[PDB]
Write a protein that binds this ligand. Structure first.
Ligand SMILES: COc1ccc(Cl)cc1C(=O)NCCc1ccc(S(=O)(=O)NC(=O)NC2CCCCC2)cc1
Ligand SMILES: [Cl-]
Length: 438
């Protein structure tokens, strides 16, 4: 009852709710579904917040706060004409860190540029920062792409997106967005400027956001039947030290030895916890910290005193090795790196193995039935989006069983000149990724 009672594959929904509560990420307030972000969850948000802030500031984006909202977007663009008069006032680059299933925390950026080229470059610069956000900190692989006309934001010229995929239930989920808004809102609010030639021009706008859904995607990606699995970059404690006594003493020697290891790690700015609670067995502690997603366990028993060593246990694959005491710092540092690398790579394999490249709709149900996505040549006719939804829904009988256009990947496979649309039989335009979704 203390651990996870539902297998991730067999009952994904119940598994997830158990993991997020028992790992002490969240705490449910009442029956409304409202929840509290405990330190373990907020810490992850703080890590990626710190990363994102440093990177957008390199792009001269400035943080700010706009408190007025309308049902849900921020009141902002109508103020821009008061700030923009000439090309010297451009580019305007703003970001806000907001607080408000539902999502409590998120980030939202807005820019305005003198032309299309500069705005579009920012759109994709930001999009890659989202990629790094997921990869370098959450160890989650994403796919960058363009939304179809039927799935893009209404006010956007085009919507670029990062897509993640949960292989266990065969569903894609939108991980982040970066819109090119063109001049759509500039026309609405007369957001105009005089260029270098004293000519009136429309500003070109972008908006981009990412929420705490990123944390959920991380959990769903890496979590296992033992509970939470944290990439070291978003775990407060990198290491837990567990003492092992055999009642034959010396507990004090073990205790002292563990404190030596704790000191070495902490002196190297590697935060860790020494679980010296007398009331709980070592086996109890193993579960306790595995459940909470601690990347590395260091065990110390009698044999380790004898051999001047310690046992290191990886959280991601449960592999154990003996390590000399004088080598603990270096090997722990390398282990933390390799754990992140392994989490990403094994997640990327599951993602790559989830994409079935097809040329005909007759290949689609085979891929959906195996809980995968399809990559197909598509004429991109907006009317066909609903047709494809309705038909895949009909053929599967099945929380939606429909597949939708996820994104047109920035990385396109070659397109043969005479390639037809997998659905309409018309000339294909580009390869599009289709799948079931959240
Ligand atoms: C619809 O139910 C299901 C029915 C059947 C199956 Cl087979 C699976 C599911 C399912 O969907 N199971 C996961 C339920 C789920 C997962 C992710 C999201 S979310 O959008 O990503 N939101 C967040 O993660 N917030 C995080 C939570 C952790 C702390 C920090 C904030 C929202 C809900
Ligand atoms: Cl506004």
């Amino acid at each position: 009852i203390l651990g996870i009672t539902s297998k991730k594959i067999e009952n994904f929904s119940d598994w997830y709710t158990q993991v997020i509560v028992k790992s002490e990420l969240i705490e449910y307030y009442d029956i409304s579904g409202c929840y509290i972000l405990r330190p373990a969850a907020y810490y992850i948000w703080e890590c990626v917040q710190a990363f994102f802030n440093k990177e957008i500031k390199k792009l001269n984006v400035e943080n700010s706060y706009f408190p007025l909202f309308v049902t849900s977007e921020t009141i902002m663009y109508s103020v821009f004409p008061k700030w923009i008069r000439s090309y010297r006032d451009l580019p305007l680059k703003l970001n806000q860190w907001n607080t408000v299933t539902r999502e409590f925390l998120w980030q939202e950026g807005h820019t305005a540029h003198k032309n299309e080229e500069e705005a579009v470059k920012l759109v994709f610069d930001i999009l890659d920062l989202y990629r790094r956000w997921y990869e370098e900190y959450l160890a989650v692989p994403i796919i960058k792409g363009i939304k179809s006309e039927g799935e893009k934001f209404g006010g956007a010229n085009f919507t670029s997106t990062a897509e993640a995929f949960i292989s266990e239930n065969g569903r894609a989920i939108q991980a982040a967005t970066s819109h090119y808004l063109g001049t759509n809102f500039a026309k609405m609010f007369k957001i105009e400027f005089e260029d270098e030639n004293e000519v009136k021009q429309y500003v070109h706008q972008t908006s981009w956001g990412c929420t705490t859904r990123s944390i959920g995607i991380m959990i769903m990606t890496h979590g296992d039947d033992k509970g939470l699995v944290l990439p070291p970059n978003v775990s407060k404690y990198k290491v837990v030290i567990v003492p092992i006594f055999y009642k034959t003493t010396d507990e004090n020697a073990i205790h002292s030895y563990c404190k030596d290891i704790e000191k070495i790690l902490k002196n190297a700015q590697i935060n860790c916890v020494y679980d010296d609670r007398a009331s709980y067995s070592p086996g109890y502690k193993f579960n306790h910290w595995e459940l909470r997603g601690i990347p590395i366990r260091i065990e110390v028993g009698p044999k380790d005193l004898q051999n001047n060593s310690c046992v290191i246990v990886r959280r991601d694959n449960n592999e154990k090795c003996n390590v000399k005491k004088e080598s603990v710092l270096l090997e722990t540092q390398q282990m933390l790196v390799d754990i992140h690398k392994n989490l990403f790579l094994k997640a990327k394999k599951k993602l790559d193995d989830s994409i079935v490249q097809v040329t005909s709709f007759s290949e689609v149900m085979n891929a959906l039935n195996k809980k995968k996505m399809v990559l197909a040549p598509w004429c991109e006719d907006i009317a066909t989006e609903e047709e494809i939804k309705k038909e895949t829904q009909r053929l599967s009988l099945n929380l939606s069983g429909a597949m939708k256009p996820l994104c047109i990947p920035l990385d396109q496979p070659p397109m043969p000149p005479n390639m037809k649309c997998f659905w309409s039989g018309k000339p294909a335009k580009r390869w599009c990724l289709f799948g079931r979704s959240y």
